[PDB]
Design a protein around this ligand. Sequence first.
Ligand SMILES: Nc1ncnc2c1ncn2[C@@H]1O[C@H](COP(=O)(O)OP(=O)(O)OP(=O)(O)O)[C@@H](O)[C@H]1O
Ligand SMILES: Nc1ncnc2c1ncn2[C@@H]1O[C@H](COP(=O)(O)OP(=O)(O)OP(=O)(O)O)[C@@H](O)[C@H]1O
Ligand SMILES: [Mg+2]
Ligand SMILES: [Mg+2]
Lengths: 635, 635
Amino acid sequence: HAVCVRHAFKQYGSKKNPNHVLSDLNMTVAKGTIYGLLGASGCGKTTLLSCIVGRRRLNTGEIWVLGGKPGTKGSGVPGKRVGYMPQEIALYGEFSIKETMMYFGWIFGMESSEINERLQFLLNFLDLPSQNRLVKNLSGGQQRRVSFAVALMHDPELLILDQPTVGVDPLLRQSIWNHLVQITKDGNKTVIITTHYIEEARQAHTIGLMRSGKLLAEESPHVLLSMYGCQSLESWGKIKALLQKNFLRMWRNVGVMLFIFALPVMQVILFCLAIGRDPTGLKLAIVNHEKNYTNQSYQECSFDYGCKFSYLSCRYLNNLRNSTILKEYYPDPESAVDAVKQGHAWGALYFTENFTDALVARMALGKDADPETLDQSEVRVWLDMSNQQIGIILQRDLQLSYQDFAKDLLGACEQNPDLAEIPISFKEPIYGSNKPSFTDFVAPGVILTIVFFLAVALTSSALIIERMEGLLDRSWVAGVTPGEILFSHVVTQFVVMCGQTALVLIFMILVFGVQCKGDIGWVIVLTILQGLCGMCFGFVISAICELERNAIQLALGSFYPTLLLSGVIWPIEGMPTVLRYVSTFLPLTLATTSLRAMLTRGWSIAEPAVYYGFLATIIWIVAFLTISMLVLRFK
Amino acid sequence: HAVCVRHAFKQYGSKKNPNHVLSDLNMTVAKGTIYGLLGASGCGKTTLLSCIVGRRRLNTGEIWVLGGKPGTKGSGVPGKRVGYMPQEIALYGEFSIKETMMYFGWIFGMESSEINERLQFLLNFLDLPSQNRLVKNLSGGQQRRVSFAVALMHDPELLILDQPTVGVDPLLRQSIWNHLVQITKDGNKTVIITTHYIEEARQAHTIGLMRSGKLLAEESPHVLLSMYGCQSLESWGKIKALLQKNFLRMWRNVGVMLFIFALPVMQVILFCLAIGRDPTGLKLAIVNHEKNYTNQSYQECSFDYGCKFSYLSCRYLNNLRNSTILKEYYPDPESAVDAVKQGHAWGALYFTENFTDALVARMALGKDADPETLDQSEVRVWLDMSNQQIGIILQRDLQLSYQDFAKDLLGACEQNPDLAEIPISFKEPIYGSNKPSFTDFVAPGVILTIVFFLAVALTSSALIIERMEGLLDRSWVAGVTPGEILFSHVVTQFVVMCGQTALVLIFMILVFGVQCKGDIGWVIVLTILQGLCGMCFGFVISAICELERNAIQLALGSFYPTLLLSGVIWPIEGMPTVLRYVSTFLPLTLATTSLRAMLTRGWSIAEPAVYYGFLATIIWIVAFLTISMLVLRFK
Ligand SMILES: Nc1ncnc2c1ncn2[C@@H]1O[C@H](COP(=O)(O)OP(=O)(O)OP(=O)(O)O)[C@@H](O)[C@H]1O
Ligand SMILES: Nc1ncnc2c1ncn2[C@@H]1O[C@H](COP(=O)(O)OP(=O)(O)OP(=O)(O)O)[C@@H](O)[C@H]1O
Ligand SMILES: [Mg+2]
Ligand SMILES: [Mg+2]
């Protein structure tokens, strides 16, 4: 009694329109007999073979195969002792015969020195081309022989062959049907072959027949006659097996695999060469009314150097920045405000005709300057602050350049160069530098973000291409637990993840100068943990989504929200009291802050603000793994 | 006659090791005969049929089918007069029988009121379930009858079928083979059927035979059986067709279709609520040495309001900000610099015990101040500038709040609050506002990026999904040119693109209140015509990528090089001359500048900094279309 099902009850669809594919289905498969499951096109026949191998639940029925119900420790359906073959060719297209016969080879614990030994016999028995040819150029008839040979070499004790001779010449059909008889002679195997060639199935021993959702009769072919008609017929092996297949997948498309190693370097060079550097090509409209106006980009600047004050208007000029500001001269203030208005400059200074006289009478006299006097020593400037980032550095430079001009007047002729100072003294910063830049605040948040997104793109179509290329539903029967496909995907992608994580760190620290006052060793550990969380975030997306087009847009749709909720281009303190609290329990918000306290401040792991990032990035790794595992086990 | 090939040559393998599948291949199909093409399993049989229909091109040979060669206007192979059923089931699984019949119905130009009668007749002839049952829900035998019916209803004059009776019971196979004879009694059509069931091929009358790349016999079966043996001889219709199919695959994912309409309202609300707002929570270490130290949040602030100068340190306090700055008090500067050092504050002020005495004199003698009294009225502050963004606001607030304190002293007893500012007066900005903010600079340029990236997510898995669900190999034969497949892919996605582009604009201008001074009419056109470039950019990715795994990686991996090279978070003036010059020739760098000159400045299209964005992004739309045309047309 290899297979025996009692009172099967299955149906498709809703209760309003039931299908009722199977009603009773009482059958018995003996040991050592070629069970032929003949029938009619339309009844439930494949749904019974797929229920024997435990691919579909029997819907409140009694089943018993090789000892017990499929998928139970008391049975043997999932394992090396049960053969299988799908109705359609479930074969990987990028694997050659010598590789597709070895991927299924040592899943069943088969030695590598015997798979090759028996491959020659299997290739000589049924005609096939050289073993080096990939199984995608094979014809429609040679793609069925490979499938027949793949799930027959391991010598099981039960065969679930269905339609194994569709698309072959009659001689090859006889040769195939002459093989199942020979291996079954000495009571060592059972065959459940079902075929649509009713005449060809006369060699069976327990020919079956189905009429309406149940077996009609199960007798010998020579006994079925004279009663109904007159004449004729009316572990370590599994892990290694699917680890050389993931590695082989990347090697098949060399040129694209090398592209992923040229993305982090290109994504980093652009960032370091664009963000942070100040503008150096902004012009100005100077209309100083104390010297003759000749030409346009030219004006005299021969002022006086010493105690005697003269031409002070062209002493503030040439004292401002000589590189970031370009000087162009206009004769009339009503023309300077015109040029900037039509986008020909970024501002317009204006020095009154009596500027030196008005300025020398404002410093000599203290707290006794009349309103008229303190109205012509002013430097009127109209700023085109429509950029909110260039006008900020323009108004931050004009007044800052006046400090040097003020010190030059005082520190060279009259007194010490310290009177012209605001009482607010900023001393020396404890941790940072007195000249902050936008390229130092954002770089901590970019290195942890580039790695996170690259890992997401890597493991985004990993769990979704298993059904794309087949070789999955027929591999579940082979004993591959769902927890091993996910585990091996982590190992193969983590190896290549570290190949680009180091490139990000090397090109951001060695080639481009970024301060690393803290421990360099712990920076590497935190970065690869974030990348591991990133690749774990791509598995839940792949597991939840089913369609190929349904998963690309979901990870792609998460680009901006994690770039704003995390603190990258703006401090986390600017958000309201509710959004900020919610935006703390996220993978990236508590990691950039921890990394920002290690690159600049120089703290160690023992500080409370540093190890929180490690604690908050490990929990999400576990949470992104159990959720993905639960979904895979669910279906 | 109908089909004839003269001296056909074809090989599959590379040089020095060819396959030599076909050598001469001379045959002739008669006017109305049933040409049965039998042969061995392994010779070139399917390749001959695929070369007849133009799917594969001969190497050095002459072909002539229905009055000329395939792909030429003289021969009607890529038209409605050639039937074609493939060896494998190339049927879309998400289409019901009625839908999958009407999709092929009005491709050949069949009236909608005529397809139903033929569908009913075919369903009655060959048994099938209800017409609204999904194809993917059918069995393995009922999925072949649908394919047979699809390539037969339009009544062609030449039927090309290969293996049309694999997977069906003999009772129905006899009826299938009894139908190709009844419809061929009159001299109207030719049937070219290749089958491996040689017993059923006797009904034809032009049986062929192949040994090695060459036809062997072209004789009648009753003549072949008596020659050298006894027995066992070894365009509007097309456009509407795939426009209700694109609109159909977007209706079976209502859970996802509603999600794509919620991404724009989530990516915008997060942006407007996190970026731009000034930080509100930060503390300071105030150690004013002029009042008794009680508790940790109390200093008895009472600075004798009026003209009398007393407790000027207390007067400077409560004058910084009542909202954004918190106050915490310490007794010793050696303890204030300790608390900030271990992350318990952001700075540490320090007022000397004689602050009022040393400050009431600095404003009294003025120029004649001695160095001893100079360094006794300074508010010593140590700033923890490790954030480079909060430490700037704090540095920009301590000195800015001193201006109010200075005016509060001048304008209190007897003076005018005018002689407290530097000789630099910034007047009134021509275009911008006197208080720039970071939220108004990134807004015109994130709105374009959001639309651009969402469009890429939409049309990225379009051209790579056509070959996944079949219905393409047999669609090229049915007169469907590559031009109309992509064109039909643009209209269906442009309609849904506008459904989320308006959501971005409405939630950014109407609700949150982003200013728009220039013209609201032309902003819609620019942001709609820019998103069209984004959806055309994704078609290039799908055209040049065969494997789907390279689509997510390429599309998602080309986003950071867009933010860092378009001027979104930094003006384009800091990059070197070479990088800046190259960057202007990009779809987004010349569009944000055009848009930034419309919401802020108020300019119109006639200005020559505005229409450049329209001109420099229309070109990229054309360039992204011809490139997708060339790759899709010829590979
Ligand atoms: N996934 C499914 N969902 C719903 N009904 C299904 C499904 N698969 C098959 N059926 C229905 O179940 C019945 C039997 O299908 P089954 O797959 O068992 O046929 P079969 O014996 O393999 O067919 P054939 O010999 O014609 O290839 C049919 O009515 C079929 O439409
Ligand atoms: N894409 C391909 N690239 C290279 N060789 C190929 C390709 N397709 C088929 N071949 C080989 O060229 C020959 C063409 O075989 P073909 O597909 O015509 O066989 P067939 O008669 O349809 O097969 P069968 O009846 O066994 O299913 C075979 O030797 C096959 O192995
Ligand atoms: Mg079957
Ligand atoms: Mg064939």
